[PDB]
Structures are given as C-alpha cells and as structure tokens.
C-alpha cells in the first residue's frame, strides 16, 4: 500500500534550519506531483508547493518563497521539505502529500512532521465551522469558492491524532474504501460533503481544497461533534 512516511520531532532554536524527509513506498515515487502542507496548531492548512520529480520543476506559495525550499532524491524515492531562518512562527505540524492521476490530485497523505522553534489566491468559505449531530443523523458540510473553481474541489478528513484522509476528489468522486455514506456535490458556488447516516468515527474535522487555481487553497474546517 502507498505510505508516505515522514520525518520526526524537529525542536530547534531560531534561525536555524531544518530539512524534514517523506519517504514513500508503494508506488512509483517519480511518476507523481509532491505537495507540502502547513497546519498550525488549532488552524486550517496552507498550501507550500509542489515538485515533480520528473524534471526538478517546484511551484510555490508566493508567501512561503524564502522560507521553504523543495526537493526530491529520486536514489532513495524521498522527497524533501528544508524550512530555512526559522521563527515563532513556522512552528506547526508540515504535511507532504502526493498526487495520483488527474484529477484525482492530492490523494495520499504522510502523517505529519512537527517543527517547534524555541529557544488574487481563491478564498473557499467553509461553513459551518462547527457543527453538533447524534449517530444517525445526515449533515451537509459546504464550501463557497471566491471564484470558479470547475469540479477541482476535494474533501479532506483529519483525525484528531493529525492524520489526513482524502474521502472526496473532482467534487464528487468517492475515494476507494471511503463509506458510501459520504457522498459530495455541486451546485454553483456551493461544494458540499453529505455525510449521511451518521457513525460515531465521522465526528472529527473536515476541509475543503481547491486545486484549480496556484495557490491550491483551503476552506477553513468543520469540527464535527456528538450532540
């Protein structure tokens, strides 16, 4: 099975840098985009970049030029993130994630590295952010796109140990294993996760990630909770 597998604990002293590692396995670590995710403590994520490691060919976030550099070693299929002059606040927990054929675009994900330091871009409205239901029940999660983002929508879950899990590609392709009471649509500006049929391990968080556009963006999370 695919597995990208990240680096440890990097606790470190300002200005110093670090270069956090995802090593991957189970499949063909060339043949596919890798992205790296910023999530600060309590935050929705942020898009860094991407590089294919085809050709060396890295795309930034224009905030995170100067900050994170991006490589791969194709001898030992481990991609790279180096955090350069670190502060305050680059302390977070840094995601790599791959893509698969398009338009299924960022859909594995490693399981999160923190970093702590101690001594025009489409906006995606997600609402609501918080959202109390019983076992059972049928609730609609929903992101608004700040401008037309086509069917380059996903729905992403996150645990609350940090781990990532694409359920929902091109706005309504179901991930394999995914239950089918998950289901996501369309309908103008409106993106929505139905989650029918509540079960108790559905009650975590959710974003959505739009990747029609550089910089991929994402909404700002729904935290899901029992009544």
């Known amino acids: 099975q695919v597995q990208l597998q990240q680096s440890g604990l990097e606790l470190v002293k300002p200005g110093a840098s670090v270069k956090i590692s995802c090593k991957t396995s189970?499949?063909?670590?060339?043949?596919?985009?890798m992205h790296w995710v910023k999530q600060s403590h309590g935050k929705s994520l942020e898009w860094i970049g991407g590089?294919?490691?085809?050709?060396?060919?890295?795309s930034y976030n224009q905030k995170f030029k100067g900050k994170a550099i991006l490589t791969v070693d194709k001898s030992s299929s481990t991609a790279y993130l180096e955090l350069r002059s670190l502060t305050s606040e680059d302390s977070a927990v840094y995601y790599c994630?791959?893509?698969?054929?398009?338009?299924?675009?960022?859909?594995?994900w490693g399981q999160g590295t923190t970093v702590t330091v101690s001594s025009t871009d489409i906006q995606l409205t997600q609402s609501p952010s918080s959202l109390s239901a019983s076992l059972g029940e049928r609730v609609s999660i929903t992101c608004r796109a700040s401008?037309?983002?086509?069917?380059?929508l996903n729905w992403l879950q996150q645990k609350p140990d940090g781990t990532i899990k694409r359920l929902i590609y091109?706005?309504?392709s179901l991930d394999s294993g995914v239950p089918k009471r998950f289901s996501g649509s369309r309908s103008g500006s409106d993106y929505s996760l139905t989650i029918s049929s509540l079960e108790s391990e559905d009650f975590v968080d959710y974003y959505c990630?739009?990747?029609?556009?550089?910089?991929?963006?994402f909404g700002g999370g729904t935290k899901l909770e029992i009544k």
């Open positions: 590089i294919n490691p085809n050709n060396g060919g890295t």
């Open positions: 091109a706005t309504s």
């Open positions: 990630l739009q990747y029609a556009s550089s910089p991929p963006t």
């Open positions: 401008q037309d983002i086509g069917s380059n």
């Open positions: 189970g499949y063909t670590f060339t043949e596919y985009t």
């Open positions: 994630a791959r893509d698969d054929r398009y338009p299924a675009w960022f859909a594995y």
